Design a protein around this ligand. Structure first.
Ligand code: PAR
Ligand code: PAR
Ligand code: K
Ligand code: K
Ligand code: MG
Ligand code: MG
Ligand code: MG
Ligand code: MG
Ligand code: MG
Ligand code: MG
Ligand code: MG
Ligand code: MG
Ligand code: MG
Ligand code: MG
Ligand code: MG
Ligand code: MG
Ligand code: MG
Ligand code: MG
Ligand code: MG
Ligand code: MG
Ligand code: MG
Ligand code: MG
Ligand code: MG
Ligand code: MG
Ligand code: MG
Ligand code: MG
Ligand code: MG
Ligand code: MG
Ligand code: MG
Ligand code: MG
Ligand code: MG
Ligand code: MG
Ligand code: MG
Ligand code: MG
Ligand code: MG
Ligand code: MG
Lengths: 119, 101, 88, 73
RNA sequence: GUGGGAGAGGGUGGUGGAAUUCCCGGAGUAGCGGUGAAAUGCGCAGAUACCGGGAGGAACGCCGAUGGCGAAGGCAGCCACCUGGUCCACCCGUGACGCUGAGGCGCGAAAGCGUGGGGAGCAAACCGGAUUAGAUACCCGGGUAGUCCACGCCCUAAACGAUGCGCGCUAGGUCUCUGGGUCUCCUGGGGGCCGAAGCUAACGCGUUAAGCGCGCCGCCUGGGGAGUACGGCCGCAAGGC
């Protein structure tokens, strides 16, 4: 128990899953949720629907902390990124801003063969 | 003897004494390496696009000098010795290139 | 590198007559300047190959010019070599 | 692509070689810290080539950013 | 020679930020990861997701191009030093000093070798999960040499434009990089595209010839046997010629 009421919401979305971390404005996590936090186990975690349920679960557990308004930060390309966004907008948390923080190297590190033909 | 521009970014948190000290040391190095100071622009505390040594701001100094080439690199190294010196960039001077002129 | 005054100094040194820029003596003198400087550079920087090709080309040019001089006026050749201290 | 307006066309006379001038150089970067392509900046090959080095110098001086966050997505 | 220019040409030192991994701290909890679907794997000794700090290695996003530089291999953050080549203008100097080039000498991607450092990510071999009739493979989880630096070897290739080098001659059009000029246009050096004449078995080439010519070098002479055997030279070896 905190009583924060305003915070950040991080949507980390890859092709295999979506995980959502609601935090206080200092960045420290309050609650988190994912495809697997809900019933889903296999590839189904990567589903947009899974992202919806995850976003909603994170938002619910967050509103238990008395959270009202959040700022959304998005990382990574994958399905259910925009679905997580939309679910957060429909969540009952006022969404202030949305931002794409997705990490990219400046030609830094050699990829796995699967990600190659690039660097 | 070639013409260069020394850029120096310093710690914004320096008061009068420490700052005047840093400037005196800088000019003592410029002297010791044979650099002659032509024109000086002190811009001062300005915002940065990214933090430098944890600080959101920096104290900017600009010198235009004439010094021997062989010593240049060495001089820069000396300027980097100081703890309160954030950045040193020595650029070989060039004539302006105008667009829409 | 080679500045203007250095270059002028060597040109007016080997010039056959006042105003002589491109005579064989001056050319060999200039080439010798560049060659000694570049060889000095390659004393260090032994891993710079690309410059070394330059050295090769310069040396070739000089040897060709000198060969022409030897062919034409053997005395002027002898004098030039003695002066610059080449071959050997 | 490059569908709005002409970065060089609306602008004054300026030294392309000046790294310390932030207010003018900002205009050549996108929402992110990225250097705008020619099709935007409206510059020429030589001009662009100079602009790049100027901007990079400024970045190292801490005057311009390297990368930035995208907003309202 | 004088004056002016563009350039990831090369060598040395310095230096910047992003990302990955690891370590420390905070907050937080039931999974993360991965695939066609999964499983191995990792996680209650607290992972994944988030923030703060630190360490290290390697590579330089945007600019970036249908672009530039180099003899070729090849060259890309930024700064300074050292250094090679090249283009243009002036028409100033020397006065055929030229071209080619068997041998020689040097350079020569990757992998590979030697000594010593280094080691984040990736990864032959290998160890596992899966798939399959089987799966020695493709897919997934790990992972050593190696990939990195210094010095010394190796000398290969679809080392490709599959097009030796130099010079002269033979319509134009069009885009582009870089100079100069009387600057809508003219003139020079690069890089592309369409095409006169002409050439070509055809495909195509066509002032960046594969056209018309001259000079010099290298090479070919049905396929397999075979880049093998023998010999010689080179190499620590692999192996090369
Ligand atoms: N910036 C210096 C450069 O050094 C080069 O070679 C040097 C660099 O490769 C390297 O310098 C340091 C090294 O001392 C130290 N042990 C580790 C450090 N990471 C290295 O620096 C470098 O490492 C590699 C090089 O491939 C890069 O990936 C990395 O970005 C760079 N920082 O080690 C070499 C000897 O100092 C070249 N001489 C030239 O590019 C340039 O001068
Ligand atoms: N070449 C390296 C790069 O050179 C650029 O600048 C280079 C070019 O702008 C400039 O070219 C000049 C040319 O302007 C001038 N009109 C004639 C001169 N011969 C050329 O210089 C050339 O020849 C000389 C030998 O004589 C070499 O030492 C030099 O490397 C080579 N560029 O020479 C400079 C040095 O090579 C970059 N500014 C520099 O940062 C970088 O090192
Ligand atoms: K065709
Ligand atoms: K032997
Ligand atoms: Mg999944
Ligand atoms: Mg690369
Ligand atoms: Mg590449
Ligand atoms: Mg270069
Ligand atoms: Mg921790
Ligand atoms: Mg417990
Ligand atoms: Mg543990
Ligand atoms: Mg380590
Ligand atoms: Mg690109
Ligand atoms: Mg190539
Ligand atoms: Mg004349
Ligand atoms: Mg005469
Ligand atoms: Mg030969
Ligand atoms: Mg090799
Ligand atoms: Mg290698
Ligand atoms: Mg080794
Ligand atoms: Mg791996
Ligand atoms: Mg594998
Ligand atoms: Mg070994
Ligand atoms: Mg070993
Ligand atoms: Mg080596
Ligand atoms: Mg090819
Ligand atoms: Mg070609
Ligand atoms: Mg061609
Ligand atoms: Mg042309
Ligand atoms: Mg042209
Ligand atoms: Mg025809
Ligand atoms: Mg054609
Ligand atoms: Mg043959
Ligand atoms: Mg036969
Ligand atoms: Mg037969
Ligand atoms: Mg063989």
């Amino acid at each position: 128990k905190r009583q924060v009421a305003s915070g950040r919401a991080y949507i980390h979305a890859s092709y295999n899953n979506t995980i959502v971390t609601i935090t206080d404005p200092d960045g420290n996590p309050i609650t988190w949720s994912s495809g697997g936090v809900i019933g889903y186990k296999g590839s189904r975690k990567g589903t947009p629907y899974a992202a919806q349920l995850a976003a909603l679960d994170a938002a619910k557990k967050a509103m238990a902390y008395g959270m009202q308004s959040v700022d959304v930060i998005v990382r990574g390309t994958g399905a259910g990124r925009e679905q997580a966004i939309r679910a957060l907008q429909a969540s009952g948390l006022q969404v202030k801003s949305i931002v794409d923080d997705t990490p990219v190297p400046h030609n830094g590190c050699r990829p796995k063969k699967k990600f190659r033909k690039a660097s | 003897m070639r013409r260069y521009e020394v850029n120096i970014v310093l710690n914004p948190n320096l008061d009068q004494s420490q700052l005047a000290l840093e400037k005196e040391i800088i000019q003592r190095a410029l002297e010791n390496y044979g650099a002659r100071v032509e024109k000086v622009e002190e811009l001062g505390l300005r915002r940065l696009a990214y933090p430098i040594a944890k600080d959101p701001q920096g104290y900017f100094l600009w010198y235009q000098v004439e010094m021997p080439e062989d010593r240049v690199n060495d001089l820069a190294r000396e300027l980097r010795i100081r703890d309160n010196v954030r950045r040193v960039m020595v650029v070989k001077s060039q004539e302006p290139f105008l667009a829409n002129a | 590198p080679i500045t203007k005054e250095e270059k002028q100094k060597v040109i007016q040194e080997f010039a056959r007559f006042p105003g002589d820029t491109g005579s064989t003596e001056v050319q060999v003198a200039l080439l010798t300047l560049r060659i000694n400087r570049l060889s000095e550079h390659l004393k260090v920087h032994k891993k710079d190959h690309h410059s070394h090709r330059g050295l090769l080309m310069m040396v070739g040019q000089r040897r060709r010019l000198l060969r022409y001089l030897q062919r034409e006026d053997p005395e002027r050749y002898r004098a030039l070599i003695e002066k610059l201290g080449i071959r050997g | 692509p490059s569908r709005k307006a002409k970065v060089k066309a609306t602008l004054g006379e300026f030294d392309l070689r000046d790294y310390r001038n932030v207010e003018v150089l900002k205009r050549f970067l996108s929402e992110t810290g990225k250097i705008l392509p020619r099709r935007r900046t409206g510059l020429s090959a030589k001009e662009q080539r100079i602009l790049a080095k100027t901007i990079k110098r400024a970045r190292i001086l801490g005057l311009l950013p390297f990368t930035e966050k995208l907003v309202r997505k």
